[PDB]
Every structure is written in structure tokens, then in C-alpha cells.
Design a protein around this ligand. Structure first.
Ligand SMILES: [Mg+2]
Length: 97
DNA sequence: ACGACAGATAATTTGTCACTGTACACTACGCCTTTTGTGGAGATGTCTAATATCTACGTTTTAACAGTGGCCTTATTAAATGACTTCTCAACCTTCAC
């Protein structure tokens, strides 16, 4: 019925091969998204090599629930003015969830 | 008129065969996460019979001695000894003898 009423979360394998800072191949990361079902903002993400795990879920949840701050190395013109807790959380059946 | 006989005729499917688009190019049941009932110690808590100890229960044994009980004959006369008691503890005069 309103914003934050149901957040939704899932993970997927990003389709970019990453590299170490020394330049050698690192297998693709996983991306986790937390999404407002009303508003349809993306509320927060976690991007990393760690497989789908409750610590990864918790890491996306932290970013989503908390206010956002980014420095000038992020050349943003907008601002990611979204925060606050969900009232419900809607997921698939993964063992992390 | 319309439609109604037997047969024409535009479909409809059955069957040929030259052509071409494509896979074969090895390269998923495998990586990763979570729950979970079974299992191995290993610190810790549980709580007894029992072989004493550890005095007392008091109970025997001793000897000391205290009390009861039996026995013990009694007389006279003499002696020795030691004592006791009582009594006594004059004094002047006369007479005849040298
Ligand atoms: Mg999912």
C-alpha cells in the first residue's frame, strides 16, 4: 500500500569478469539488490565475490536501511535520498533467505 | 425460377528431388550455502555404606575395714613391791645411892 511496505531481495551473478588490481582474472561477482515494491526505487545493493549468504543478505540490508553518503569520487549529480526499514521482506527460498 | 441430372474443373493432398541451413567443433549436474539429527569426549555434579574414632554406657572386681558375735571363772590367804591413811614426837620432881 505504500513505500517500504514490502521490500524485495535477490542475488545474481554479474556478467562481467573482474580482475585483481594486478590485472589477473577474477571470476564474476554476485550482485544483491534490495528494492521498494511501491516506488520501485532500488533501495540498496551489495556487490562482491561472496556467494549468496546470510552475511551478504545482511550486508545489502545494512546499505538499504541506512542513509546513503558518497564522496566526490562518486561524481553524482543526484542523491540517493532513500532509507528506513521495510515493514515486510519478500524473497525466494534460498538457504540464505 | 431455381436447382437438379451426369460430368468438368479448380482445388486438395501424395509424392519427387534439388537445395540449404545447421551442428559437429565438448563443455552442467556442479559450486556454494544452510540446517540438523547423531555422535565423542570431558568437566562437573551426585551421594552413599563402612570401617573406623572415641567417648560413654556404666558394669565387675578389690580391698579395706566396720560392724556383729563368741569367748574369757571366781574366792581366800601369804609374800614382794609401790602407795595412801592414822597416831606419836613430856618435864618436873622424888629417892637412893658416895
Ligand atoms: Mg534468487
Amino acid at each position: 500500500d505504500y513505500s517500504n511496505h514490502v521490500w524485495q531481495c535477490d542475488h545474481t551473478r554479474v556478467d562481467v569478469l573482474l580482475v585483481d588490481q594486478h590485472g589477473e582474472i577474477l571470476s564474476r561477482p554476485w550482485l544483491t539488490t534490495v528494492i521498494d515494491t511501491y516506488s520501485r526505487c532500488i533501495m540498496g545493493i551489495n556487490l562482491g565475490f561472496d556467494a549468496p549468504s546470510s552475511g551478504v543478505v545482511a550486508l545489502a540490508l545494512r546499505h538499504a536501511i541506512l542513509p546513503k553518503r558518497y564522496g566526490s569520487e562518486y561524481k553524482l549529480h543526484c542523491e540517493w535520498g532513500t532509507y528506513g526499514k521495510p515493514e515486510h521482506f519478500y524473497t525466494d527460498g534460498g538457504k540464505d533467505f
